[PDB]
Amino acid sequence: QLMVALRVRPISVAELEEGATLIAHKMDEQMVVLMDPMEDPDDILRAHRSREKSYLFDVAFDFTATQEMVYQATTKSLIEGVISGYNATVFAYGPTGCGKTYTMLGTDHEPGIYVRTLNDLFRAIEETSNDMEYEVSMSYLEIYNEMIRDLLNPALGYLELREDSKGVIQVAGITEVSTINAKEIMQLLMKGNRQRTQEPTQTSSRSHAVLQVAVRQRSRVKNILQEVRQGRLFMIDLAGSERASQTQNRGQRMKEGAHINRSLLALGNCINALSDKGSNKYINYRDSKLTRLLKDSLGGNSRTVMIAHISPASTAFEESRNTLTYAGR
C-alpha cells in the first residue's frame, strides 16, 4: 500500500535572477500541471503536443501548505499502525534544492516531518498506556556511497546488515540512542548530521539520511499471553540522480554518481514490484544498500509514503519533468 505526494516549493530569488518564470502549478488538491517554456532556434514544435502536461498524485502541495498541513496529509495516519506492530516508510525524493530536507527536518521556526511525527507518536503512546507498555528507540544515520556513519558512535564506517533466525534483515552494530524528548531528537540529528559527507567543493548531493524509530508494545494483562508487537517507522531524506556526462564527475565524484544511480534504480525496481505483480517473484530487495536496511519493512502489510519535490521554476523544467514522470500516478 503506497501513497505518493508532490510538493512544490516556492520559487527562489536565485531562480528569478537567472530569469525564470513559473511553469509549475497546483491546479487541484491532487493535480499539478507543468507548462513547457520555449527556446529556439527550433522548434519544429507548435505542433506543440503540449505546451502543458498534466500530472496526478494522491495529494499535492504548493507554497500555500504549511509544514503541519503536509505532515497531516502524509504521515500522521501512519502512527496508529506503527505502535501496533506494523511497519512504515516515508521518503523525501527529488533533485537537490527542491525541498527534501525542509520537508523532513524543517527548521527551528518551521519543523518538518521528523518531530511532528515523533510528537504524535508519544501522545498516541500515552493515550493508550492504560492498556499497554511501550518502549521507544530512535537512531539517525547516514548512507553515503554505501558507507554508514551511525551519526553517533565514532569508530565504525562499514556496518553490514545481517539476518536474524526469521530472515529479517537488520543493520548489525548500528548505534541506538535512547531519546526522551523532541528537543533531544533534534539535537541528535543536528550533532550527527555534521558527519554526513558534504560536497568536497554544504551537504553532499549523495547523502541519505535515515531516521528510524522502533516501538515495542506488550499488554499489561499478564494472565493471557498475546503477541508482543514491534513496529518500525523509517523516515528518509535522500539526494538526487546524477547525470555524470553533465557535471563531469571523476574518481571520487565519478564513482559517487554510479552508486546513487544504482541505489535509486534498486529502489525504483523494489517499489515497481510492490506496486504491481505479484508473487513476485520476490520483490528485488537484494538490489543494493538502503534496501538491506529496509528489507524486513516495505512488504505486504506495510505502508509507504513518497514525497516528491520540485521547483516551480522554468529553469528547472527538465528535472521537474523527470520527477513528475517518475512519481506520476
Could you explain how this protein is built, in words?
It is classed as motor protein. With 329 residues, the protein is of the alpha/beta class. The chain has one domain: Kinesin motor domain (Kinesin), CATH 3.40.850.10. Helix content is 28%, strand content 24%. It is built from 9 helices and 13 strands. The chain has helices spanning 13-18, 67-74, 78-83, 100-104, 113-126, 182-193, 251-275, 291-294, 317-327, and strands at residues 2-8, 24-26, 31-35, 52-56, 59-61, 88-93, 132-144, 147-148, 161-163, 169-171, 207-219, 229-237, 303-310. The strands form 3 sheets. The chain has an 8-stranded mixed beta sheet with strand order 5-1-13-6-12-11-7-8, sandwiched between helices. Strands 2-3-4 form a 3-stranded antiparallel beta sheet, covered by helices on one side. A two-stranded antiparallel ribbon has the order 9-10. A hairpin with a 2-residue loop joins strand 7 and strand 8 (147-148). The radius of gyration is 21 Å and the shape is globular. The two termini are 13 Å apart.
Order of helices and strands: EHEEEEHHEHHEEEEHEEHHEH
Oligomer: monomer
Question: How many domain regions?
Answer: 1
Query: In terms of structural class, how would the helical and strand content be classed?
Result: alpha/beta
Number of strands: 13
- Using the coordinates above, name the CATH class: Alpha Beta
Shape: globular
The percent range for helix content is 25-40%
* CATH superfamily annotation: Kinesin motor domain
Global Rg? 21 Å
Approximate strand percentage: 15-25%
Please list the strands of the largest sheet in the order they lie side by side. Answer: 5-1-13-6-12-11-7-8
Largest sheet: 8 strands, mixed
> What is the number of helical segments per DSSP (H or I, 4+ residues)?
9
PDB class: motor protein
Keywords: Kinesin-8, KIF19A, Plus-end directed motor, Microtubule depolymerization
Assembly: monomeric
Entry title: Kinesin-8 motor, KIF19A, in the nucleotide-free state complexed with GDP-taxol microtubule
